[PDB]
Amino acid sequence: NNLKDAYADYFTIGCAVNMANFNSSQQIALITSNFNSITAENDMKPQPTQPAEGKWNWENADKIANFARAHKIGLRGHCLVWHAQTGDWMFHGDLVSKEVLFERMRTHIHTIVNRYKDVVYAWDVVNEAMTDDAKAEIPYRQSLYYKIAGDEFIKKAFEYAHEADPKALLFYNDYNETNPAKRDRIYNMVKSMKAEGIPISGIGMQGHYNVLSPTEDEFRKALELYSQVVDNIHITELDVRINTLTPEADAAQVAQYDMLFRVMRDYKHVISNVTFWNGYDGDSWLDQRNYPLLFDENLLPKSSFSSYYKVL
């Protein structure tokens, strides 16, 4: 009886998976025991699935989706539109017009959402569109997407995704979600886009936190703020690194996870999903120096697993 059962009344619990996860038996036993949602770590992003116009690459995404269908695990669809891990061919060599970008965008969104809408219950439609912080000047990350189409590519992405599966939750997804300047900008854009009618179902807080990172004041400020503009929130790539093996680090980590999950339970009426960004300390994208997750290098539960699991 893992995380998913302890949190049944509160929200789903997910992890991001890759081909090595969906490989070995002990790892699969860890994820089936503990998670009722899954996100594809890499194999559903734009460059991996459409490395060239019309050259779709479905193999790894199919295996993950088949895992989610067969094993009755919900699947978060990670990443329709992103300045990163996207083919440079999407934009250009000379820069394409708005119209051409939008035709490229609509074709990519509608092709992949229709392949997976049977399992996918939520999508990160737009990823990381706002700038890191510095009312006046532009709030938007100055990617090629923004350069070509301004604000408008964010609007289009949600409308194409909603067009391709109207029953899916569509998330705006971002990191540094607790930083106040960036927090305020994520709030405004989502408020203004929902006001123009664009179908932004919910906000994705990435949760790439650390052992002192977000103070629970900041965490709570972000959650309440975001809560007044969307009916759904997902904590979408949660890890808390111990940096910036010892018994002291473990205590600091146990303490952050206790607070982090304390506030999240307090906002269980907005939070539908809490997903961690890899599987175990040994396959964390940060590499083993940061020890970010609740399972250790040998898949064993950490001190923070038991602290988050035993509440009330």
Catalogue the active-site residues. 128, 237
CB-based contact 304:254 (threshold 8 Å): yes
Q: How many CB atoms lie within 10 A of CB 114?
A: 11
Specify whether the CB–CB gap between 239 and 269 falls below 8 A: no
CB of 75 closer than 8 Å to CB of 120? yes
Tokens at residue 235, please? 């904590």
54: left (phi over 0), alpha (psi -120 to 50) or beta: left
DSSP-assigned beta bridge partners for residue 81: 126
172-211 residues labelled b (16+ CB within 10 A) or e (exposed): bbbbbbbbeebbebbbebbeebeeeebbbbbbbbbbbbbb
In the 8-state DSSP scheme, what is residue 7? T
Say how far apart CA 151 and CA 202 lie, in whole Å.
Answer: 18
- Is residue 148 within 8 A of residue 200, CB to CB? The reply is no
Amino acid at 2: N
Residue 125: alpha-carbon gap to chain centroid: 10
Q: Are 105 and 156 in contact (CB under 8 A)?
A: yes
C-alpha to C-alpha distance for 276 and 237, rounded to whole angstroms? 5
Could you give the number of structural domains in the chain? 1
**Cα–Cα distance for residue pair 224/265, rounded to 1 Å:** 13
* Residue found under tokens 């017009």: 97
The pair of three-digit structure tokens given for residue 115, joined into one six-digit string: 């392949």
Q: Which of 39, 38, 20, 21 is nearest to 29 (CA)?
A: 21
Three-state DSSP at 29 gives: helix
d(Cα 8, Cα 1) in Å, to the nearest integer?
11
Structural domain that includes position 191:
1-312
